[PDB]
Amino acid sequence: KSLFQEQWSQFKLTHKKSYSSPIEEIRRQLIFKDNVAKIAEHNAKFEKGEVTYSKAMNQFGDMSKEEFLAYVNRGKAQNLRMPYVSSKKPLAASVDWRSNAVSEVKDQGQCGSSWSFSTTGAVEGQLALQRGRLTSLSEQNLIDCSSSYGNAGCDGGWMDSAFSYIHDYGIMSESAYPYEAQGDYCRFDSSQSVTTLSGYYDLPSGDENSLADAVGQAGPVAVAIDATDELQFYSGGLFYDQTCNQSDLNHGVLVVGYGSDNGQDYWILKNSWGSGWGESGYWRQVRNYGNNCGIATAASYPAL
């Protein structure tokens, strides 16, 4: 049994892979092989200190860069907005909401619904931090119910649009309204609404300091980034993406902290690709590095 065969076997087992057909499995095996090489190539660079972050196999191992890009692009989005007022306080050196203001890392699966996870995480952060009780919230509720707000379920949506939905209706717990990774019928039941929202704050576009201010002073902030294939196998370390821009946003996530690691400013972001991706589902990305991948381009957080 070759190393590769064992890697492939571990990949399929670990990631619960049962392909639609033998040919599909064979084609995926080859993609996986290619990905293993790309990861190894990247990690060679990492060990040489030519990159600050490592890559590792994850459940996207069997996806090509094109499929991965289609995946992150699939969820591109197609009153209640309150203006952010910057606290005007010194930026806390470092903030990390992971111990107390974040739900479990979730997995949007094969559904372009990152917007809904970004939404629930931001609301969850506010429930934790404003109400003193974190309840993991239902993305499905948002997916099934907020289409008239401009959201398109597994084909994209917008955190602010979801926040407005929550304002007009509410949001049930993840538990009460579990994630299906597919569009389904709205089964929102207001008696089970964990919370509504009074509105939300859009943070000044591209302003990483305002984002940091909000992260420290309000809590986890919903952001949309330009996810590129660089993220596909991000494993650990300070991520930076030389391939993304700040404007072509396609992926809603959650900034759950920031700090500085040996002089290098970073954001801590929560993804929705499961805990097998990145640093247990989170990643650190360069902060104050030209708003890398548009982290602070479309940042918002809700007011309960």
Side-chain angles (χ1 to χ4, degrees), residues 103-109 111-124 137-140 142-143 159 162 174 179-181 222 251-254 270-273:
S103 60
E104 61 281 2
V105 174
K106 303 164 175 191
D107 190 334
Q108 65 186 274
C111 173
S113 56
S114 69
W115 62 271
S116 72
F117 287 87
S118 180
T119 305
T120 56
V123 181
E124 291 158 358
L137 296 177
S138 174
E139 295 77 25
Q140 196 65 39
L142 301 175
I143 285 162
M159 287 82 80
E174 188 71 82
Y179 183 59
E180 298 171 28
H251 188 58
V253 290
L254 188 74
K270 191 183 187 204
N271 214 331
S272 48
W273 296 337

PDB file of all heavy atoms in Angstrom, residues 103-109 111-124 137-140 142-143 159 162 174 179-181 222 251-254 270-273:
ATOM      1  N   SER A 103     -20.111  30.137  18.717  1.00  0.00           N
ATOM      2  CA  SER A 103     -20.642  28.781  18.706  1.00  0.00           C
ATOM      3  C   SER A 103     -19.563  27.864  18.167  1.00  0.00           C
ATOM      4  O   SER A 103     -18.498  28.311  17.766  1.00  0.00           O
ATOM      5  CB  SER A 103     -21.874  28.704  17.816  1.00  0.00           C
ATOM      6  OG  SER A 103     -21.533  29.082  16.487  1.00  0.00           O
ATOM      7  N   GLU A 104     -19.863  26.575  18.144  1.00  0.00           N
ATOM      8  CA  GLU A 104     -19.007  25.581  17.526  1.00  0.00           C
ATOM      9  C   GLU A 104     -18.747  25.993  16.080  1.00  0.00           C
ATOM     10  O   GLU A 104     -19.518  26.738  15.480  1.00  0.00           O
ATOM     11  CB  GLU A 104     -19.693  24.213  17.546  1.00  0.00           C
ATOM     12  CG  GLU A 104     -21.067  24.163  16.748  1.00  0.00           C
ATOM     13  CD  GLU A 104     -22.289  24.760  17.482  1.00  0.00           C
ATOM     14  OE1 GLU A 104     -22.136  25.277  18.620  1.00  0.00           O
ATOM     15  OE2 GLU A 104     -23.415  24.708  16.910  1.00  0.00           O
ATOM     16  N   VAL A 105     -17.634  25.531  15.544  1.00  0.00           N
ATOM     17  CA  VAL A 105     -17.352  25.688  14.136  1.00  0.00           C
ATOM     18  C   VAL A 105     -18.341  24.808  13.399  1.00  0.00           C
ATOM     19  O   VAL A 105     -18.565  23.642  13.744  1.00  0.00           O
ATOM     20  CB  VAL A 105     -15.914  25.283  13.793  1.00  0.00           C
ATOM     21  CG1 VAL A 105     -15.692  25.319  12.277  1.00  0.00           C
ATOM     22  CG2 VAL A 105     -14.933  26.231  14.479  1.00  0.00           C
ATOM     23  N   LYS A 106     -18.958  25.386  12.395  1.00  0.00           N
ATOM     24  CA  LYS A 106     -19.948  24.679  11.644  1.00  0.00           C
ATOM     25  C   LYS A 106     -19.397  24.446  10.257  1.00  0.00           C
ATOM     26  O   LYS A 106     -18.254  24.813   9.944  1.00  0.00           O
ATOM     27  CB  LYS A 106     -21.246  25.488  11.617  1.00  0.00           C
ATOM     28  CG  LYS A 106     -21.755  25.779  13.020  1.00  0.00           C
ATOM     29  CD  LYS A 106     -22.802  26.892  13.020  1.00  0.00           C
ATOM     30  CE  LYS A 106     -23.399  27.086  14.415  1.00  0.00           C
ATOM     31  NZ  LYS A 106     -24.612  27.985  14.342  1.00  0.00           N
ATOM     32  N   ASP A 107     -20.213  23.817   9.435  1.00  0.00           N
ATOM     33  CA  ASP A 107     -19.786  23.463   8.123  1.00  0.00           C
ATOM     34  C   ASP A 107     -20.948  23.696   7.180  1.00  0.00           C
ATOM     35  O   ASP A 107     -21.954  23.023   7.262  1.00  0.00           O
ATOM     36  CB  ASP A 107     -19.345  21.999   8.097  1.00  0.00           C
ATOM     37  CG  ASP A 107     -18.654  21.631   6.808  1.00  0.00           C
ATOM     38  OD1 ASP A 107     -18.909  22.275   5.760  1.00  0.00           O
ATOM     39  OD2 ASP A 107     -17.829  20.698   6.855  1.00  0.00           O
ATOM     40  N   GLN A 108     -20.795  24.653   6.286  1.00  0.00           N
ATOM     41  CA  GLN A 108     -21.855  24.976   5.347  1.00  0.00           C
ATOM     42  C   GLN A 108     -22.056  23.862   4.338  1.00  0.00           C
ATOM     43  O   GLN A 108     -23.066  23.841   3.649  1.00  0.00           O
ATOM     44  CB  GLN A 108     -21.537  26.274   4.610  1.00  0.00           C
ATOM     45  CG  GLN A 108     -20.315  26.169   3.741  1.00  0.00           C
ATOM     46  CD  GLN A 108     -19.951  27.497   3.162  1.00  0.00           C
ATOM     47  OE1 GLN A 108     -20.470  27.900   2.106  1.00  0.00           O
ATOM     48  NE2 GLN A 108     -19.059  28.198   3.843  1.00  0.00           N
ATOM     49  N   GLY A 109     -21.087  22.953   4.252  1.00  0.00           N
ATOM     50  CA  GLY A 109     -21.154  21.833   3.335  1.00  0.00           C
ATOM     51  C   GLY A 109     -21.187  22.322   1.905  1.00  0.00           C
ATOM     52  O   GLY A 109     -20.602  23.373   1.585  1.00  0.00           O
ATOM     53  N   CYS A 111     -23.070  23.957  -0.174  1.00  0.00           N
ATOM     54  CA  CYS A 111     -24.157  24.904  -0.152  1.00  0.00           C
ATOM     55  C   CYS A 111     -23.436  26.223  -0.013  1.00  0.00           C
ATOM     56  O   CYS A 111     -22.544  26.353   0.822  1.00  0.00           O
ATOM     57  CB  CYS A 111     -25.055  24.646   1.058  1.00  0.00           C
ATOM     58  SG  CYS A 111     -26.331  25.893   1.319  1.00  0.00           S
ATOM     59  N   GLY A 112     -23.759  27.165  -0.883  1.00  0.00           N
ATOM     60  CA  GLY A 112     -23.124  28.470  -0.867  1.00  0.00           C
ATOM     61  C   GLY A 112     -23.833  29.343   0.137  1.00  0.00           C
ATOM     62  O   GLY A 112     -24.437  30.350  -0.218  1.00  0.00           O
ATOM     63  N   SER A 113     -23.756  28.946   1.401  1.00  0.00           N
ATOM     64  CA  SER A 113     -24.553  29.573   2.432  1.00  0.00           C
ATOM     65  C   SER A 113     -23.690  30.254   3.492  1.00  0.00           C
ATOM     66  O   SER A 113     -24.165  30.509   4.593  1.00  0.00           O
ATOM     67  CB  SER A 113     -25.415  28.515   3.107  1.00  0.00           C
ATOM     68  OG  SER A 113     -24.573  27.489   3.607  1.00  0.00           O
ATOM     69  N   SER A 114     -22.431  30.537   3.171  1.00  0.00           N
ATOM     70  CA  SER A 114     -21.524  31.141   4.150  1.00  0.00           C
ATOM     71  C   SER A 114     -22.150  32.399   4.758  1.00  0.00           C
ATOM     72  O   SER A 114     -21.973  32.677   5.940  1.00  0.00           O
ATOM     73  CB  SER A 114     -20.173  31.471   3.526  1.00  0.00           C
ATOM     74  OG  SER A 114     -20.287  32.535   2.600  1.00  0.00           O
ATOM     75  N   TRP A 115     -22.909  33.135   3.950  1.00  0.00           N
ATOM     76  CA  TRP A 115     -23.597  34.335   4.420  1.00  0.00           C
ATOM     77  C   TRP A 115     -24.443  34.045   5.651  1.00  0.00           C
ATOM     78  O   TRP A 115     -24.552  34.883   6.537  1.00  0.00           O
ATOM     79  CB  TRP A 115     -24.498  34.894   3.324  1.00  0.00           C
ATOM     80  CG  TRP A 115     -25.587  33.941   2.895  1.00  0.00           C
ATOM     81  CD1 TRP A 115     -25.499  33.009   1.928  1.00  0.00           C
ATOM     82  CD2 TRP A 115     -26.907  33.845   3.427  1.00  0.00           C
ATOM     83  NE1 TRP A 115     -26.673  32.335   1.797  1.00  0.00           N
ATOM     84  CE2 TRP A 115     -27.558  32.817   2.722  1.00  0.00           C
ATOM     85  CE3 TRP A 115     -27.607  34.534   4.433  1.00  0.00           C
ATOM     86  CZ2 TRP A 115     -28.869  32.445   2.977  1.00  0.00           C
ATOM     87  CZ3 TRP A 115     -28.918  34.167   4.695  1.00  0.00           C
ATOM     88  CH2 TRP A 115     -29.539  33.128   3.964  1.00  0.00           C
ATOM     89  N   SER A 116     -25.058  32.868   5.696  1.00  0.00           N
ATOM     90  CA  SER A 116     -25.944  32.502   6.814  1.00  0.00           C
ATOM     91  C   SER A 116     -25.141  32.167   8.053  1.00  0.00           C
ATOM     92  O   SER A 116     -25.590  32.406   9.171  1.00  0.00           O
ATOM     93  CB  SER A 116     -26.891  31.345   6.432  1.00  0.00           C
ATOM     94  OG  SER A 116     -26.201  30.099   6.327  1.00  0.00           O
ATOM     95  N   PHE A 117     -23.948  31.609   7.861  1.00  0.00           N
ATOM     96  CA  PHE A 117     -23.082  31.271   8.990  1.00  0.00           C
ATOM     97  C   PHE A 117     -22.418  32.506   9.543  1.00  0.00           C
ATOM     98  O   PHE A 117     -22.260  32.664  10.755  1.00  0.00           O
ATOM     99  CB  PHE A 117     -22.037  30.245   8.550  1.00  0.00           C
ATOM    100  CG  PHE A 117     -22.621  28.896   8.346  1.00  0.00           C
ATOM    101  CD1 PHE A 117     -23.179  28.545   7.117  1.00  0.00           C
ATOM    102  CD2 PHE A 117     -22.695  28.003   9.405  1.00  0.00           C
ATOM    103  CE1 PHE A 117     -23.799  27.309   6.944  1.00  0.00           C
ATOM    104  CE2 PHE A 117     -23.297  26.751   9.235  1.00  0.00           C
ATOM    105  CZ  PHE A 117     -23.842  26.403   8.002  1.00  0.00           C
ATOM    106  N   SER A 118     -22.016  33.383   8.633  1.00  0.00           N
ATOM    107  CA  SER A 118     -21.504  34.671   9.017  1.00  0.00           C
ATOM    108  C   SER A 118     -22.581  35.389   9.824  1.00  0.00           C
ATOM    109  O   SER A 118     -22.307  35.932  10.893  1.00  0.00           O
ATOM    110  CB  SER A 118     -21.145  35.473   7.769  1.00  0.00           C
ATOM    111  OG  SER A 118     -20.658  36.729   8.168  1.00  0.00           O
ATOM    112  N   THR A 119     -23.818  35.354   9.327  1.00  0.00           N
ATOM    113  CA  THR A 119     -24.942  35.937  10.060  1.00  0.00           C
ATOM    114  C   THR A 119     -25.117  35.323  11.442  1.00  0.00           C
ATOM    115  O   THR A 119     -25.154  36.032  12.450  1.00  0.00           O
ATOM    116  CB  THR A 119     -26.270  35.779   9.302  1.00  0.00           C
ATOM    117  OG1 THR A 119     -26.134  36.326   7.984  1.00  0.00           O
ATOM    118  CG2 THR A 119     -27.383  36.503  10.041  1.00  0.00           C
ATOM    119  N   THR A 120     -25.265  34.004  11.502  1.00  0.00           N
ATOM    120  CA  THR A 120     -25.530  33.394  12.795  1.00  0.00           C
ATOM    121  C   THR A 120     -24.386  33.650  13.767  1.00  0.00           C
ATOM    122  O   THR A 120     -24.622  33.955  14.922  1.00  0.00           O
ATOM    123  CB  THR A 120     -25.780  31.906  12.700  1.00  0.00           C
ATOM    124  OG1 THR A 120     -24.670  31.284  12.049  1.00  0.00           O
ATOM    125  CG2 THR A 120     -27.068  31.632  11.966  1.00  0.00           C
ATOM    126  N   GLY A 121     -23.148  33.557  13.300  1.00  0.00           N
ATOM    127  CA  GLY A 121     -22.013  33.807  14.177  1.00  0.00           C
ATOM    128  C   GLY A 121     -22.019  35.210  14.765  1.00  0.00           C
ATOM    129  O   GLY A 121     -21.677  35.403  15.922  1.00  0.00           O
ATOM    130  N   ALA A 122     -22.378  36.202  13.955  1.00  0.00           N
ATOM    131  CA  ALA A 122     -22.378  37.586  14.408  1.00  0.00           C
ATOM    132  C   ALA A 122     -23.500  37.743  15.424  1.00  0.00           C
ATOM    133  O   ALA A 122     -23.322  38.361  16.471  1.00  0.00           O
ATOM    134  CB  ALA A 122     -22.572  38.530  13.229  1.00  0.00           C
ATOM    135  N   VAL A 123     -24.650  37.148  15.135  1.00  0.00           N
ATOM    136  CA  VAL A 123     -25.755  37.239  16.077  1.00  0.00           C
ATOM    137  C   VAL A 123     -25.397  36.460  17.337  1.00  0.00           C
ATOM    138  O   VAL A 123     -25.576  36.954  18.453  1.00  0.00           O
ATOM    139  CB  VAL A 123     -27.100  36.765  15.473  1.00  0.00           C
ATOM    140  CG1 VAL A 123     -28.227  36.913  16.502  1.00  0.00           C
ATOM    141  CG2 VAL A 123     -27.410  37.531  14.231  1.00  0.00           C
ATOM    142  N   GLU A 124     -24.859  35.260  17.163  1.00  0.00           N
ATOM    143  CA  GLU A 124     -24.421  34.464  18.304  1.00  0.00           C
ATOM    144  C   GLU A 124     -23.475  35.251  19.178  1.00  0.00           C
ATOM    145  O   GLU A 124     -23.569  35.178  20.402  1.00  0.00           O
ATOM    146  CB  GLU A 124     -23.746  33.173  17.855  1.00  0.00           C
ATOM    147  CG  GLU A 124     -24.724  32.195  17.234  1.00  0.00           C
ATOM    148  CD  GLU A 124     -24.074  31.172  16.326  1.00  0.00           C
ATOM    149  OE1 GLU A 124     -22.841  31.218  16.113  1.00  0.00           O
ATOM    150  OE2 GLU A 124     -24.813  30.319  15.807  1.00  0.00           O
ATOM    151  N   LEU A 137     -27.122  29.443  16.522  1.00  0.00           N
ATOM    152  CA  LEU A 137     -28.315  29.810  15.778  1.00  0.00           C
ATOM    153  C   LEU A 137     -28.430  29.092  14.452  1.00  0.00           C
ATOM    154  O   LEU A 137     -27.443  28.591  13.922  1.00  0.00           O
ATOM    155  CB  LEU A 137     -28.359  31.317  15.555  1.00  0.00           C
ATOM    156  CG  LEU A 137     -28.484  32.122  16.851  1.00  0.00           C
ATOM    157  CD1 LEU A 137     -28.433  33.612  16.504  1.00  0.00           C
ATOM    158  CD2 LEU A 137     -29.800  31.759  17.580  1.00  0.00           C
ATOM    159  N   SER A 138     -29.650  29.079  13.921  1.00  0.00           N
ATOM    160  CA  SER A 138     -29.989  28.316  12.735  1.00  0.00           C
ATOM    161  C   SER A 138     -29.702  29.052  11.432  1.00  0.00           C
ATOM    162  O   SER A 138     -30.377  30.021  11.089  1.00  0.00           O
ATOM    163  CB  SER A 138     -31.461  27.947  12.766  1.00  0.00           C
ATOM    164  OG  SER A 138     -31.808  27.324  11.536  1.00  0.00           O
ATOM    165  N   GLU A 139     -28.720  28.564  10.685  1.00  0.00           N
ATOM    166  CA  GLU A 139     -28.483  29.064   9.338  1.00  0.00           C
ATOM    167  C   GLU A 139     -29.634  28.670   8.431  1.00  0.00           C
ATOM    168  O   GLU A 139     -30.005  29.396   7.503  1.00  0.00           O
ATOM    169  CB  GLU A 139     -27.179  28.494   8.795  1.00  0.00           C
ATOM    170  CG  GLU A 139     -25.947  28.953   9.573  1.00  0.00           C
ATOM    171  CD  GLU A 139     -25.753  28.233  10.891  1.00  0.00           C
ATOM    172  OE1 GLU A 139     -26.236  27.089  11.040  1.00  0.00           O
ATOM    173  OE2 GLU A 139     -25.111  28.802  11.795  1.00  0.00           O
ATOM    174  N   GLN A 140     -30.203  27.504   8.707  1.00  0.00           N
ATOM    175  CA  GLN A 140     -31.239  26.956   7.870  1.00  0.00           C
ATOM    176  C   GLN A 140     -32.431  27.869   7.908  1.00  0.00           C
ATOM    177  O   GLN A 140     -33.064  28.095   6.893  1.00  0.00           O
ATOM    178  CB  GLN A 140     -31.660  25.570   8.368  1.00  0.00           C
ATOM    179  CG  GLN A 140     -32.435  24.801   7.323  1.00  0.00           C
ATOM    180  CD  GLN A 140     -31.577  24.493   6.120  1.00  0.00           C
ATOM    181  OE1 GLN A 140     -30.397  24.179   6.257  1.00  0.00           O
ATOM    182  NE2 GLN A 140     -32.157  24.595   4.936  1.00  0.00           N
ATOM    183  N   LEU A 142     -32.397  30.952   8.220  1.00  0.00           N
ATOM    184  CA  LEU A 142     -32.087  32.057   7.334  1.00  0.00           C
ATOM    185  C   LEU A 142     -32.195  31.636   5.887  1.00  0.00           C
ATOM    186  O   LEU A 142     -32.742  32.359   5.058  1.00  0.00           O
ATOM    187  CB  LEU A 142     -30.677  32.563   7.605  1.00  0.00           C
ATOM    188  CG  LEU A 142     -30.472  33.041   9.033  1.00  0.00           C
ATOM    189  CD1 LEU A 142     -29.008  33.412   9.261  1.00  0.00           C
ATOM    190  CD2 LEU A 142     -31.424  34.218   9.353  1.00  0.00           C
ATOM    191  N   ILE A 143     -31.655  30.459   5.597  1.00  0.00           N
ATOM    192  CA  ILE A 143     -31.644  29.908   4.256  1.00  0.00           C
ATOM    193  C   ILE A 143     -33.058  29.725   3.736  1.00  0.00           C
ATOM    194  O   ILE A 143     -33.379  30.174   2.633  1.00  0.00           O
ATOM    195  CB  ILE A 143     -30.857  28.576   4.239  1.00  0.00           C
ATOM    196  CG1 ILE A 143     -29.358  28.872   4.322  1.00  0.00           C
ATOM    197  CG2 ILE A 143     -31.199  27.693   3.023  1.00  0.00           C
ATOM    198  CD1 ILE A 143     -28.567  27.675   4.740  1.00  0.00           C
ATOM    199  N   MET A 159     -25.244  39.005   4.736  1.00  0.00           N
ATOM    200  CA  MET A 159     -25.428  39.022   6.167  1.00  0.00           C
ATOM    201  C   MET A 159     -26.417  40.103   6.581  1.00  0.00           C
ATOM    202  O   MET A 159     -27.293  39.854   7.402  1.00  0.00           O
ATOM    203  CB  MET A 159     -24.088  39.213   6.872  1.00  0.00           C
ATOM    204  CG  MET A 159     -23.229  37.993   6.831  1.00  0.00           C
ATOM    205  SD  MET A 159     -22.376  37.916   5.261  1.00  0.00           S
ATOM    206  CE  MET A 159     -21.032  39.069   5.581  1.00  0.00           C
ATOM    207  N   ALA A 162     -29.782  39.115   5.861  1.00  0.00           N
ATOM    208  CA  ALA A 162     -30.200  38.150   6.872  1.00  0.00           C
ATOM    209  C   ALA A 162     -30.505  38.847   8.186  1.00  0.00           C
ATOM    210  O   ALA A 162     -31.483  38.508   8.849  1.00  0.00           O
ATOM    211  CB  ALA A 162     -29.157  37.047   7.055  1.00  0.00           C
ATOM    212  N   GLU A 174     -29.822  26.705  16.265  1.00  0.00           N
ATOM    213  CA  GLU A 174     -29.291  25.658  15.449  1.00  0.00           C
ATOM    214  C   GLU A 174     -29.996  24.355  15.796  1.00  0.00           C
ATOM    215  O   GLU A 174     -30.355  23.574  14.911  1.00  0.00           O
ATOM    216  CB  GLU A 174     -27.791  25.515  15.742  1.00  0.00           C
ATOM    217  CG  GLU A 174     -27.075  24.567  14.789  1.00  0.00           C
ATOM    218  CD  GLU A 174     -26.960  25.188  13.419  1.00  0.00           C
ATOM    219  OE1 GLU A 174     -26.030  25.988  13.226  1.00  0.00           O
ATOM    220  OE2 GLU A 174     -27.808  24.894  12.547  1.00  0.00           O
ATOM    221  N   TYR A 179     -29.168  22.415  10.384  1.00  0.00           N
ATOM    222  CA  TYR A 179     -28.652  22.788   9.100  1.00  0.00           C
ATOM    223  C   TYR A 179     -28.779  21.626   8.144  1.00  0.00           C
ATOM    224  O   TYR A 179     -28.434  20.508   8.491  1.00  0.00           O
ATOM    225  CB  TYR A 179     -27.202  23.177   9.242  1.00  0.00           C
ATOM    226  CG  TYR A 179     -26.627  23.654   7.954  1.00  0.00           C
ATOM    227  CD1 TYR A 179     -27.182  24.748   7.293  1.00  0.00           C
ATOM    228  CD2 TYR A 179     -25.533  23.021   7.393  1.00  0.00           C
ATOM    229  CE1 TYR A 179     -26.654  25.204   6.093  1.00  0.00           C
ATOM    230  CE2 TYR A 179     -24.982  23.478   6.203  1.00  0.00           C
ATOM    231  CZ  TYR A 179     -25.552  24.567   5.565  1.00  0.00           C
ATOM    232  OH  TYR A 179     -25.034  25.026   4.385  1.00  0.00           O
ATOM    233  N   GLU A 180     -29.259  21.905   6.937  1.00  0.00           N
ATOM    234  CA  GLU A 180     -29.495  20.863   5.951  1.00  0.00           C
ATOM    235  C   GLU A 180     -28.552  20.982   4.775  1.00  0.00           C
ATOM    236  O   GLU A 180     -28.505  20.086   3.934  1.00  0.00           O
ATOM    237  CB  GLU A 180     -30.931  20.935   5.451  1.00  0.00           C
ATOM    238  CG  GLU A 180     -31.972  20.718   6.540  1.00  0.00           C
ATOM    239  CD  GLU A 180     -33.368  21.019   6.064  1.00  0.00           C
ATOM    240  OE1 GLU A 180     -33.613  20.864   4.849  1.00  0.00           O
ATOM    241  OE2 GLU A 180     -34.211  21.406   6.896  1.00  0.00           O
ATOM    242  N   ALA A 181     -27.824  22.104   4.712  1.00  0.00           N
ATOM    243  CA  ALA A 181     -26.944  22.427   3.571  1.00  0.00           C
ATOM    244  C   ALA A 181     -27.690  22.349   2.248  1.00  0.00           C
ATOM    245  O   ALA A 181     -27.138  21.950   1.225  1.00  0.00           O
ATOM    246  CB  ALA A 181     -25.687  21.516   3.560  1.00  0.00           C
ATOM    247  N   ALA A 222     -19.387  40.037  11.395  1.00  0.00           N
ATOM    248  CA  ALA A 222     -19.632  39.433  10.090  1.00  0.00           C
ATOM    249  C   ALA A 222     -18.871  40.214   9.050  1.00  0.00           C
ATOM    250  O   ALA A 222     -18.950  41.443   8.991  1.00  0.00           O
ATOM    251  CB  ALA A 222     -21.113  39.444   9.761  1.00  0.00           C
ATOM    252  N   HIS A 251     -17.379  35.221   0.147  1.00  0.00           N
ATOM    253  CA  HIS A 251     -17.444  34.302   1.258  1.00  0.00           C
ATOM    254  C   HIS A 251     -17.633  35.044   2.577  1.00  0.00           C
ATOM    255  O   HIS A 251     -16.782  35.815   2.993  1.00  0.00           O
ATOM    256  CB  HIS A 251     -16.185  33.427   1.280  1.00  0.00           C
ATOM    257  CG  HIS A 251     -16.235  32.310   2.280  1.00  0.00           C
ATOM    258  ND1 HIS A 251     -17.212  31.341   2.269  1.00  0.00           N
ATOM    259  CD2 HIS A 251     -15.400  31.989   3.298  1.00  0.00           C
ATOM    260  CE1 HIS A 251     -16.999  30.489   3.258  1.00  0.00           C
ATOM    261  NE2 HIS A 251     -15.905  30.862   3.899  1.00  0.00           N
ATOM    262  N   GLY A 252     -18.768  34.796   3.216  1.00  0.00           N
ATOM    263  CA  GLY A 252     -19.101  35.444   4.470  1.00  0.00           C
ATOM    264  C   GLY A 252     -18.515  34.642   5.606  1.00  0.00           C
ATOM    265  O   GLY A 252     -18.704  33.423   5.697  1.00  0.00           O
ATOM    266  N   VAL A 253     -17.786  35.329   6.473  1.00  0.00           N
ATOM    267  CA  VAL A 253     -17.218  34.693   7.639  1.00  0.00           C
ATOM    268  C   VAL A 253     -17.368  35.621   8.816  1.00  0.00           C
ATOM    269  O   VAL A 253     -18.174  36.544   8.800  1.00  0.00           O
ATOM    270  CB  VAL A 253     -15.728  34.271   7.407  1.00  0.00           C
ATOM    271  CG1 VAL A 253     -15.668  33.106   6.416  1.00  0.00           C
ATOM    272  CG2 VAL A 253     -14.895  35.454   6.879  1.00  0.00           C
ATOM    273  N   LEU A 254     -16.599  35.361   9.848  1.00  0.00           N
ATOM    274  CA  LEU A 254     -16.795  36.032  11.103  1.00  0.00           C
ATOM    275  C   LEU A 254     -15.439  36.315  11.678  1.00  0.00           C
ATOM    276  O   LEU A 254     -14.616  35.399  11.846  1.00  0.00           O
ATOM    277  CB  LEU A 254     -17.551  35.114  12.068  1.00  0.00           C
ATOM    278  CG  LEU A 254     -17.990  35.755  13.383  1.00  0.00           C
ATOM    279  CD1 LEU A 254     -19.164  36.697  13.148  1.00  0.00           C
ATOM    280  CD2 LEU A 254     -18.342  34.671  14.405  1.00  0.00           C
ATOM    281  N   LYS A 270     -13.459  33.006  11.929  1.00  0.00           N
ATOM    282  CA  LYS A 270     -14.135  31.751  12.013  1.00  0.00           C
ATOM    283  C   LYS A 270     -14.659  31.436  10.648  1.00  0.00           C
ATOM    284  O   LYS A 270     -15.393  32.228  10.074  1.00  0.00           O
ATOM    285  CB  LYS A 270     -15.324  31.877  12.959  1.00  0.00           C
ATOM    286  CG  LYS A 270     -15.961  30.538  13.317  1.00  0.00           C
ATOM    287  CD  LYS A 270     -17.191  30.775  14.200  1.00  0.00           C
ATOM    288  CE  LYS A 270     -17.728  29.466  14.707  1.00  0.00           C
ATOM    289  NZ  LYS A 270     -19.181  29.576  15.059  1.00  0.00           N
ATOM    290  N   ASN A 271     -14.336  30.263  10.137  1.00  0.00           N
ATOM    291  CA  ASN A 271     -14.885  29.846   8.858  1.00  0.00           C
ATOM    292  C   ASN A 271     -16.076  28.943   9.097  1.00  0.00           C
ATOM    293  O   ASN A 271     -16.395  28.635  10.246  1.00  0.00           O
ATOM    294  CB  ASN A 271     -13.827  29.124   8.015  1.00  0.00           C
ATOM    295  CG  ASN A 271     -13.994  29.401   6.538  1.00  0.00           C
ATOM    296  OD1 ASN A 271     -15.107  29.640   6.061  1.00  0.00           O
ATOM    297  ND2 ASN A 271     -12.903  29.375   5.813  1.00  0.00           N
ATOM    298  N   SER A 272     -16.724  28.516   8.018  1.00  0.00           N
ATOM    299  CA  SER A 272     -17.828  27.569   8.107  1.00  0.00           C
ATOM    300  C   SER A 272     -17.540  26.371   7.219  1.00  0.00           C
ATOM    301  O   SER A 272     -18.416  25.915   6.480  1.00  0.00           O
ATOM    302  CB  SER A 272     -19.118  28.238   7.661  1.00  0.00           C
ATOM    303  OG  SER A 272     -18.898  28.910   6.424  1.00  0.00           O
ATOM    304  N   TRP A 273     -16.313  25.872   7.296  1.00  0.00           N
ATOM    305  CA  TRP A 273     -15.885  24.693   6.540  1.00  0.00           C
ATOM    306  C   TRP A 273     -15.533  23.556   7.472  1.00  0.00           C
ATOM    307  O   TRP A 273     -14.776  22.675   7.103  1.00  0.00           O
ATOM    308  CB  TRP A 273     -14.664  25.010   5.676  1.00  0.00           C
ATOM    309  CG  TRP A 273     -14.950  26.025   4.634  1.00  0.00           C
ATOM    310  CD1 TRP A 273     -16.171  26.347   4.110  1.00  0.00           C
ATOM    311  CD2 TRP A 273     -13.994  26.842   3.966  1.00  0.00           C
ATOM    312  NE1 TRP A 273     -16.034  27.327   3.173  1.00  0.00           N
ATOM    313  CE2 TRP A 273     -14.709  27.651   3.055  1.00  0.00           C
ATOM    314  CE3 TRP A 273     -12.597  26.976   4.052  1.00  0.00           C
ATOM    315  CZ2 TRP A 273     -14.088  28.584   2.240  1.00  0.00           C
ATOM    316  CZ3 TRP A 273     -11.964  27.911   3.213  1.00  0.00           C
ATOM    317  CH2 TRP A 273     -12.719  28.704   2.330  1.00  0.00           C
TER     318      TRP A 273
END
